[PDB]
Amino acid sequence: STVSFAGQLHAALDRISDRQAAARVQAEKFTLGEPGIALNDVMADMQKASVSMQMGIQVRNKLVAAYQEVMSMQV
Template sequence: MTISAIQSVLQQLQTTALSASSLAGPAEGVAAGGFSDELRKSLDRISDSQQHAYGQAESFELGKPGVALNDVMVDLQKANIDFQMGLQVRNKLVSAYQDVMNMSV
């Protein structure tokens, strides 16, 4: 994996973090918490997205008013996309780590 590929993954993470933080509140800046803090926040957002989607699905199954099937399906797809994105980021990070470890000095 090249440096540009790693930078591309980091840029995608930052873009996702900025777009998600703009929905959650004012941006704090990446430098304040560092990479591990941003990664933890991203994982928390993925978890929250999944919990919300499963909660919506359960509410629909129980027949609670105000929960439409199309909203449930969209929330479940969003949670799935969030999970797949997180999985791909993890795969890229593991691949980058392996490439760095295999470099000869």
Template sequence: MSIAAIESVLHQMRATALQGGFAPRMDSGASEAVQGSGGFAGEFKRTLERINGTQQQAYGKAEDFELGKPGVALNDVMVDLQKANVAFQTGLQVRNRLVAAYQEVMSLPA
């Protein structure tokens, strides 16, 4: 897998996140990366944090539904849980491809 392919996956993940309404958080780590010091590792870390946030939000909404809090509909809970699952599966596939690319690079003759 080439760097261009990895960058393409990152671009697709960014576009999907923006379409899903996830704006990049501007905490101290993110502000450094926005200024250009994060690179691939920073972008990957922010993506993992967004995936975690999506999962935490979905699990929180599911817990609210289980507790019977008003204003929490089952269909919203199910949609949020599916979004969290898709985000996790996407992150897992990116990780798998990164590991495969790393193994490929490490097996190249010196």
């Protein structure tokens, strides 16, 4: 139907938030004493979540720079 790239940014933010929340709840469950979950799995998922979050931060920085530049053309 339509892409509505504000919807794409919303989807990216939702992905980042969901990944961090999943890592957080896995650390929750593991330190709570729940059997199953392993330590290396916890740390690996936390690492991946950190990388995705820095992904979002870099996209933020460059979008803000782009907008601050498109607001400089004289009309």
